[PDB]
Amino acid sequence: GKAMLNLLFSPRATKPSALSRAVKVFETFEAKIHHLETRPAQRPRAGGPHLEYFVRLEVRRGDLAALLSGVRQVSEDVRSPAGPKVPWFPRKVSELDKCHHLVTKFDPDLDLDHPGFSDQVYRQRRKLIAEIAFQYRHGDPIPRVEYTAEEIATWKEVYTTLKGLYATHACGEHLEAFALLERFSGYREDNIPQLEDVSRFLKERTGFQLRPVAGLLSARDFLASLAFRVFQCTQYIRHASSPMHSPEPDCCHELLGHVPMLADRTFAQFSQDIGLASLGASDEEIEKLSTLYWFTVEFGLCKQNGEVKAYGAGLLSSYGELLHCLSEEPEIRAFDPEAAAVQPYQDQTYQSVYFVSESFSDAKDKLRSYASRIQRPFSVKFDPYTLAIDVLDSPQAVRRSLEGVQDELDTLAHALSAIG
Amino acid sequence: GKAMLNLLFSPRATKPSALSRAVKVFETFEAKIHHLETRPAQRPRAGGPHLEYFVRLEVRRGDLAALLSGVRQVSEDVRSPAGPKVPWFPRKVSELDKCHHLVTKFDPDLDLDHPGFSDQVYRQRRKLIAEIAFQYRHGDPIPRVEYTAEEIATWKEVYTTLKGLYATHACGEHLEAFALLERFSGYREDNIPQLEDVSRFLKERTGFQLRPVAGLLSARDFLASLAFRVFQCTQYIRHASSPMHSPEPDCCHELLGHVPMLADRTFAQFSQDIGLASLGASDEEIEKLSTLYWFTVEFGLCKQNGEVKAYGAGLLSSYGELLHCLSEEPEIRAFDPEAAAVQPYQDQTYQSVYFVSESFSDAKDKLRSYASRIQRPFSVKFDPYTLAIDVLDSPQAVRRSLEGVQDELDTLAHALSAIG
Amino acid sequence: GKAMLNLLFSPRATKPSALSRAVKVFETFEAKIHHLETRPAQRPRAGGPHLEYFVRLEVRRGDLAALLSGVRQVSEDVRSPAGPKVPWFPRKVSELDKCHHLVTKFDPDLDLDHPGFSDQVYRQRRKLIAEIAFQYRHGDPIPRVEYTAEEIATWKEVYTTLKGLYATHACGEHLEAFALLERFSGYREDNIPQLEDVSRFLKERTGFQLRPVAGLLSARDFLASLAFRVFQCTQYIRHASSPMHSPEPDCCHELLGHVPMLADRTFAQFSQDIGLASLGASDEEIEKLSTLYWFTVEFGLCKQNGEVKAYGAGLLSSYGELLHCLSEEPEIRAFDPEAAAVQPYQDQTYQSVYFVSESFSDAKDKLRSYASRIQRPFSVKFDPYTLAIDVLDSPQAVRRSLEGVQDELDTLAHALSAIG
Amino acid sequence: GKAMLNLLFSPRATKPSALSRAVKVFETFEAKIHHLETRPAQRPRAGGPHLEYFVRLEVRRGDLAALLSGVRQVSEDVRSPAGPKVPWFPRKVSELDKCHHLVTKFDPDLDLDHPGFSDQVYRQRRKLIAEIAFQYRHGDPIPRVEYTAEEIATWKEVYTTLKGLYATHACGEHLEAFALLERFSGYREDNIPQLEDVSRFLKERTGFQLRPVAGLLSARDFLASLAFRVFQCTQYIRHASSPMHSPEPDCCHELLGHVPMLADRTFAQFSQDIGLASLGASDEEIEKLSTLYWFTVEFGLCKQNGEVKAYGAGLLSSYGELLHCLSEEPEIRAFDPEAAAVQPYQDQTYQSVYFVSESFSDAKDKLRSYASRIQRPFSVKFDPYTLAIDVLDSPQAVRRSLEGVQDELDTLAHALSAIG
Ligand SMILES: [Fe+3]
Ligand SMILES: [Fe+3]
Ligand SMILES: [Fe+3]
Ligand SMILES: [Fe+3]
């Protein structure tokens, strides 16, 4: 009906505590009368400036502005409107599209991040791929993607090289996953698998599913998509002439690092949890989370059989950088969210500093901490049945969740009583 | 520092919505300025009187009184202080003493509710029992209690009387309970049981334990004591000349109905829950709960093998009334707190209407139901380790409780992994 | 390697307790040695015949048969091989095709149960629908289904009639569900809503989803399918000349009774739980559960505002039978697992006896009991993530389930700590 | 009835797989015929000796012995009887006495472990204290214990010294615990806190309670007692001339380390779980657990504010050894169950190696770990209501426990719904 504002009122003088006059200019333009509680304070925490009061005001713009001007006549502030309030995040699987296509699609992506590649044919490829993923509607499967003989041959080259180095120093869990794929996905030197097949495989495995895209445009919204246990992909490939170094994550990147790790139950869980943090997360909070993701997913360093092995997506997609990180001259601390919260990094050169990991569970634990540690006006949960999020803002929502929780509990109870 | 009041303000005219003048008299005597949000309302729920604004006022008594007078000059009310706020309840086992015997001790009880018995001997007995129960400090065991030959002979008489009709029509669970007692408690025709013995028997059995009580003075505090899984016990006996009908619950009453019922795990827990209702519960809510106890505990009918049986404590303590209730001429509905909420009853003659019970579980269930729909500014839980109450007023308390819950949970989980 | 048998040995004489000779014919043809424990018994349970010993025998068919013959020479039985042990049930959403088409497809169904209709066009419709549903592969969506103007007009007629009687006595929850459909699904008098759209709506609602079916061939496997929260649907319609009475469930049956109820969260859960019980249930147990389904799903009688309302699928798929059941002359007992375990019924005449329902939760409860009461060699659970069944046969499986359980639990914990 | 044996059979030759002859000598003396399954094996695990068959035998001693002799005539072993099988442990708070006094009491302890002390008065003190503690019956309160002025003065001396050095390097949580004592317990320089007072304070804090003991004779049974959250304590004093170094734990030891630590909730629970490990645990397993206790309870190092602080009982009971451990010249690893599983140690001089602790939670975790990987034929749990152990040997016990678990769960649920 009327025009409501949001709390942003920091005057300059300290006298605006009861404001001593301005509650009247609030009410004379139809303010409100709730339970009042704010008096002179800051006794143990001395050195106190003016007090942050939130005199909410919802009337026509003229009256609210005139009364805020009246306050600024005696105070030194006006209640500026439009509180962003953790700007936004979706709630349901389908909604992962419009808010995120409208922010990540119908943008003409130049050939490569390096300005200009003499790959007009690649330009055709990427444009057509985009105009496949662009109009993607959730729930509908993905149309088949052809591949010419050149990306075929390069997939083959990298298949060989990588498989050649796979037993070498890689995560044995990743490696048996890869074997499972090679026998199930359709991983072969000659032929490169589609995404629909492998993604359906993964759905049976973990329920995670791929999604197609051209640009990562919002790591924020990217991490959001992953919160839904849905991974995003770019069905196009590096330049053939760029087989080993990837100037940008491609199929060789994703299909090779990400998925043949993502197959794990609890590791995929952890991956999801990362996104679950990101819901509506602030710009700099988003940056922190994405930064974590950097040192923990694309660039993740496990420890198999007591000795250290590698499990990072990009690492497990890189050929020579793979060897680089494995070598000693790159530094490896251990994983910590805070230590990674502002841990610097570059993008192109062979990254050196790393956060070694020993247990996916431990990663989950530090995530739980930092996320809980991440301030939040709310909380969220993911329902598996609906595949959608569970808004957690009230004791009542918690009750709603734990109801079904206890349901499954007694289910296990009856099951156990039955067994034996 | 200052003098705070509680929200009791209902004017007569409807103009006091913003109070229209009285916020000024609030602030001129040092009111407070927090977030205000309340305006004229009752659009869909039309036909509305004045609005209930909560303008708290914590200044000196003169200032608050003068400003409330200023309001009542234009409004038609004053913010009445001293909110009772669910008057009181304890928190810890030992605390069951001071505030509850300040209200239930040092009251000189005459001989009986009937004015005057010519049983000066019974007067001596009652006085001495009291001056034992009087100075009882929690945790310390109960001193031994002697019993002259007459209450002995009567205990024997009643033992016999019941024992013949005991197996008849009673709750088989209570029956085998008394079996375990007669073989363990010391229940015998000749000798009367002490109370500490059977008390220990219950602590091993269920953790419930006795407490000496002279007067029931507060069913409220009585139900409270129960909430702690502690049942106040009478250390005194009906008149010998009053063997069958007791004008008041005695050792014969409780020793025979209550304890050989309290033997059950879940039924004891249920009893406890009834107490858990009583926490600070309002006077009339207290009356409702006590009423519930009436038709549910001393006077309750079970149903063994599909045929109804007796399980009410007083019933399981009465001899002739016992025959009355099991007979057809008294009415028997089924248990329902709401149906029992204002279900009438007398006390002296043979009670007719009963709320039959199918299973203790059902009782627990509708108890949870009413307790929930029992309005309460809070909630309470019982810590089994410390035997204390668990104040439930914030998500944080719930959190700290469910923490230990999960602890025991994974304890079970590890055990399970171990077993087999 | 060798040929193993299963325990089917019930001799006639009582001597085979230690077998007294036949352990030797077991071993001379390569018997085996676990912990030997079986002797003469049945002391308190006197009147005992021969004892059931399980001397497993895994050798070539000649040796096992010859030794069983040696036993039958002195005993009176042979260890009959190939114990089916509720021979089958699927585990994953995919397998819901192979064993399920192999059990329900490639069977040429005549026009209707009544031998012969003069509806060659209906025969064409049924054949084409089948040869759509026949080749259904899991995960792939359902191709569109056209509808000629006659089923259109009849859908319109029934839409009207039913809508004319919707407020009449129908489940108000179901009814508001239908409102959500009419505003969301595409429920309209003119047009027949497809299955894919409404089923997607349902997945958002409940996660349940449809599956095309022509022949119900196995109610057993039908209930199995629904255990996966997947309802088999018949994309065809009753005879136009048979608008009100349906000799067989059709779209007008299913879309009109089933889904406008199934949309409830907990009721859908309960429905699934039924199937979960049926998971590889035994033939007679299958009959029992299907019988239950009869009186509890298509024909279920709810109770809104304390007065009884209708909520059975077939009921709210029936037009005049719907009026029949609502009337008094058909009997309505209350829902009971056992009373419905063998409650008789016919199929054609307007059914009389009903099992009135007061709360879906109570139906859940009676299920939980009877299911648990249903003996099984094991138990099972449903994972929502993988959408697959969880086999429960060992403490270890219970453990691994409880692990994720506690995971979600601590998720709630951290959320709770965060909120507020 | 008959005489049963236990599985102890390891022949020498490899021929005893089906025993090839000895099943007959078993059955001719009334053997038993259960389901048998074991043949020649060790195909993937080649290089195998004879097979371990469990042919039990319960007939009179003559038959079992003669048939075992017949086996040893052809095999090379006899089924040795009397399997101790984690020899014993109590179950309830009461039984903690007899099976533990019969093993740890009525033993005349000499003056000191060092043979001969000219402390005849100390001998009197120890004798009288024993003849108080020895005949203690569980649940009964503790008679008062006097102390002459000398142990009083030395108590004061150490109170001063330690309190002086308490702020130095100690656990801040422990330190505020000490403050809580000094203000509530009766911990003061001049007068020494009794045991009953502080034990009550602990039942308030945690429910832990002390118990008088002269000799620790069975660390096994000692740790068992602690599993009940009950700590055995020695109500006598070190030699006055031995104030700083104690050749043995005394009140100056226990009152100073143990109780001012146990005040923590989760640390108390952790301590309890340690005892929980000890349930019937084997001799060398007992040694392992006690060894753990050594480096983790009397001698443990915490880490407050990131810098290491002390929290070991004996450490915070030692004065000069206290100064020793905190200093650098002794080694301090971190707490690791396995690294502490067989970590060597001495007793008398100033111990060097230490297993530093970051959080009590960490200890809880590694305890859960080792306990799990501690083999046990079963599991156990502790009921708070009954204060007694919960046997875990079958799913059904798990069931009945998790039942109450879910009970408390929905208790929290109803509370949650109520709150707000
Ligand atoms: Fe990537
Ligand atoms: Fe009573
Ligand atoms: Fe149907
Ligand atoms: Fe000690």
Author numbering:
A (entry chain C), B (entry chain D), C (entry chain B), D (entry chain A): 78 to 497
Lines quoted from the article behind this entry:
Tyrosine hydroxylase (TH) catalyzes the rate-limiting step in the biosynthesis of dopamine (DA) and other catecholamines, and its dysfunction leads to DA deficiency and parkinsonisms. Mammalian AAAHs mainly present as homotetramers with a three-domain subunit structure: an N-terminal regulatory domain (RD) that consists of a structured ACT (aspartate kinase-chorismate mutase-TyrA) domain preceded by a less structured N-terminal tail of varying length; a central catalytic domain (CD) that contains the active site iron and binding-sites for substrate and cofactor; and a C-terminal oligomerization domain (OD) responsible for dimerization and/or tetramerization. Inhibition by catecholamines and reactivation by S40 phosphorylation are key regulatory mechanisms of TH activity and conformational stability. We used Cryo-EM to determine the structures of full-length human TH without and with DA, and the structure of S40 phosphorylated TH, complemented with biophysical and biochemical characterizations and molecular dynamics simulations.
The structure of human apo-TH (3.9 Å resolution) shows a planar, tetrameric core that comprises the CD and OD domains, and two smaller densities on opposite sides and 15 Å apart from the central structure. The final map, with an estimated resolution of 3.9 Å (FSC = 0.143), shows a central tetrameric structure formed by the CD and OD domains that is 110 Å long, 86 Å wide and 38 Å high. The two small masses of the RDs, separated 15 Å from the main body, have a dimeric structure and a parallelepiped-like shape of 40 × 40 × 22 Å. The two masses were placed on opposite sides of the central part of the TH structure, allowing full access to the active sites of the enzyme. In the 3D reconstruction, many structural features could be assigned to α-helices and loops in the central structure formed by CD and OD domains, in particular the α-helices involved in tetramerization. In the RD domains, four α-helices were clearly visible, two of them involved in dimer formation. However, there were areas of lower resolution, so we sought to determine the local resolution of each area of the map using MonoRes34, which showed a non-isotropic resolution distribution of the map, between 2 Å at the central part of the tetrameric structure and 10 Å at the RDs. An attempt to improve the local resolution of the latter by treating them as single particles did not result in a noticeable increase to resolution (7.1 Å), suggesting that this dimeric structure has intrinsic flexibility. The structural stabilization of the N-terminal residues 39–77 in the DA-bound state, both in full-length TH and THNΔ35, was necessary for their visualization, as they were not observed in the apo-TH state (whose structural model starts at the ACT domain) or in the THS40p conformation.
